Amino acid sequence: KAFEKKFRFDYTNERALRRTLQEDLVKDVLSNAHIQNELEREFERMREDREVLRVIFPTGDSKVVLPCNLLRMIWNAQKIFHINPRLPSDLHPIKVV
Amino acid sequence: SNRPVMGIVQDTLTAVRKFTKRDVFLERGEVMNLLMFLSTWDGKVPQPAILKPRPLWTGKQIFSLIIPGHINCIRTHSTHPDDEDSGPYKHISPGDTKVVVENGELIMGILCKKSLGTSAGSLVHISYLEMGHDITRLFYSNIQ
Amino acid sequence: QGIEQISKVYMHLPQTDNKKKIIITEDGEFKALQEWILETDGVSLMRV
Amino acid sequence: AGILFEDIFDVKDIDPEGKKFDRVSRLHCESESFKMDLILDVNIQIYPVDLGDKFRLVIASTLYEDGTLDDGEYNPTDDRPSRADQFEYVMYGKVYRIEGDETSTEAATRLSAYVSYGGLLMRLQGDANNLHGFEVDSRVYLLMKKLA
């Protein structure tokens, strides 16, 4: 339940989409079903990767060693580009995918 | 072990802990004397954390000058109580025990072995991974 | 009765995650069941 | 003007957790006008503060009271008129966090702005309307003056 709530993109909630994305991006997300299908595919493959991770780490230890520190890189991007976490963003989900 | 092999040591480590304590205030002359030992100083004296009744700079300000580039790091002082992260003062530490280096500036927390030691994720490790070996060398020398 | 080459057998409950039996519940969470694991002072792997 | 916030606060506690630092004390204060809670680290050694003390607090983007940016560089020789002359305790810091009670849909009715004055932490919590002038990573001056 937590995985679905935290990782499954919710293109159904107009209020949440307004809060997070800009109006044009919200219109694009809600209007056409192709982007919605792409987001659903993203979540589906993430669920498959979740099962793969479950197989790889039966003990459930989430700590792993990997080349790039994505969290720190995201923080660096936020600080470099003065990303305001309060205003809606102009980053479009299919661009992300 | 994908972690720094050399870190801050006995005198420098204890003195940086004392220096980064919250209640360290440096007068103008002391601040200039310390700034004389910054090889990477840009020559601009930072605005003191306290302007009146007297101009006073903090050890955190001076160490923010020491810190290279704009690295970002989160650590916890050795004396960090486990319940603080769940308490109402999570982002404002009563004991100044949560280390938050943001945009290359130390805004809170007391530095210690956990932050400046050989442990992975240390401030020095992030400095090496972000700025490179030369800038991390200047960092080790400037702290010392 | 019993298997040769095994002198003593100790039975105890493990207090560490590695020796605990980790399963995935219906909700999908990782639950560390406390199960009975026994060790031996001798080795007969095929028979055991 | 460049005054992001202004009010009068009354000290309620001086160190509820305890005197953790000798020269720094954490005042817990409340404002009667805007009903704002304040937590502030103050250098009591040079600016002693006692329980029940009332003080005017001003959080401003600049000291020149002309809209000119301070540039964040020390400049004691500057003779430009400064609003710091009227106040007793002046601190320079950076607002590093702005939390709110906003949910996924509704906006934030209550906001909490965190500022770091070179390690001395301040937390101004209250109605979101009064804290609209705070933007993260923005330098800010804190001005305090005891009121008799």
UniProtKB/Swiss-Prot annotation, chain A:
Describe how it is modified after translation: The tandem heptapeptide repeats in the C-terminal domain (CTD) can be highly phosphorylated. The phosphorylation activates Pol II. Phosphorylation occurs mainly at residues 'Ser-2' and 'Ser-5' of the heptapeptide repeat and is mediated, at least, by CDK7 and CDK9. POLR2A associated with DNA is specifically phosphorylated at 'Ser-5' of the CTD by CDK7, promoting transcription initiation by triggering dissociation from DNA. Phosphorylated at 'Ser-2', Ser-5' and 'Ser-7' of the CTD by CDK9 (P-TEFb complex), promoting transcription elongation. Among tandem heptapeptide repeats of the C-terminal domain (CTD) some do not match the Y-S-P-T-S-P-S consensus, the seventh serine residue 'Ser-7' being replaced by a lysine. 'Lys-7' in these non-consensus heptapeptide repeats can be alternatively acetylated, methylated and dimethylated. EP300 is one of the enzyme able to acetylate 'Lys-7'. Acetylation at 'Lys-7' of non-consensus heptapeptide repeats is associated with 'Ser-2' phosphorylation and active transcription. Regulates initiation or early elongation steps of transcription specially for inducible genes.
As for subcellular location, the record says: Nucleus; Cytoplasm; Chromosome
Annotated disease = Neurodevelopmental disorder with hypotonia and variable intellectual and behavioral abnormalities: An autosomal dominant neurodevelopmental disorder characterized by profound infantile-onset hypotonia, developmental delay with poor speech, delayed walking, and impaired intellectual development. Additional variable features include feeding difficulties, dysmorphic features, and visual defects.
Please provide the record's free-text comment about the domains of this protein. The C-terminal domain (CTD) serves as a platform for assembly of factors that regulate transcription initiation, elongation, termination and mRNA processing. The trigger loop allows entry of NTPs into the active site, switching between an open and closed state with each NTP addition cycle.
Q: What functional role does this protein have?
A: Catalytic core component of RNA polymerase II (Pol II), a DNA-dependent RNA polymerase which synthesizes mRNA precursors and many functional non-coding RNAs using the four ribonucleoside triphosphates as substrates. Pol II-mediated transcription cycle proceeds through transcription initiation, transcription elongation and transcription termination stages.
The text of the family note is: Belongs to the RNA polymerase beta' chain family.
Q: What is this protein called?
A: DNA-directed RNA polymerase II subunit RPB1
Q: Please give the organism.
A: Homo sapiens
Gene that specifies this protein: POLR2A
Part of the whole protein covered: 914 to 1010 of 1970
UniProtKB/Swiss-Prot annotation, chain C:
Q: Which disease does the record tie it to?
A: Neurodevelopmental disorder with hypotonia and variable intellectual and behavioral abnormalities: An autosomal dominant neurodevelopmental disorder characterized by profound infantile-onset hypotonia, developmental delay with poor speech, delayed walking, and impaired intellectual development. Additional variable features include feeding difficulties, dysmorphic features, and visual defects.
Which subcellular locations apply to this protein? Answer: Nucleus; Cytoplasm; Chromosome
The domain section of the record reads:
The C-terminal domain (CTD) serves as a platform for assembly of factors that regulate transcription initiation, elongation, termination and mRNA processing.
Q: Which residues of the full protein are shown?
A: 1299 to 1346 of 1970
Q: In which organism is this protein found?
A: Homo sapiens (Human)
Q: What is this protein called?
A: DNA-directed RNA polymerase II subunit RPB1
What about PTM?
The tandem heptapeptide repeats in the C-terminal domain (CTD) can be highly phosphorylated. The phosphorylation activates Pol II. Phosphorylation occurs mainly at residues 'Ser-2' and 'Ser-5' of the heptapeptide repeat and is mediated, at least, by CDK7 and CDK9. POLR2A associated with DNA is specifically phosphorylated at 'Ser-5' of the CTD by CDK7, promoting transcription initiation by triggering dissociation from DNA. Phosphorylated at 'Ser-2', Ser-5' and 'Ser-7' of the CTD by CDK9 (P-TEFb complex), promoting transcription elongation.
* Free-text function comment from the UniProt entry: Catalytic core component of RNA polymerase II (Pol II), a DNA-dependent RNA polymerase which synthesizes mRNA precursors and many functional non-coding RNAs using the four ribonucleoside triphosphates as substrates. Pol II-mediated transcription cycle proceeds through transcription initiation, transcription elongation and transcription termination stages.
Q: How does it assemble?
A: Component of the RNA polymerase II (Pol II) core complex consisting of 12 subunits: a ten-subunit catalytic core composed of POLR2A/RPB1, POLR2B/RPB2, POLR2C/RPB3, POLR2I/RPB9, POLR2J/RPB11, POLR2E/RPABC1, POLR2F/RPABC2, POLR2H/RPABC3, POLR2K/RPABC4 and POLR2L/RPABC5 and a mobile stalk composed of two subunits POLR2D/RPB4 and POLR2G/RPB7, protruding from the core and functioning primarily in transcription initiation. Part of Pol II(G) complex, in which Pol II core associates with an additional subunit POLR2M; unlike conventional Pol II, Pol II(G) functions as a transcriptional repressor.
Family label = Belongs to the RNA polymerase beta' chain family.
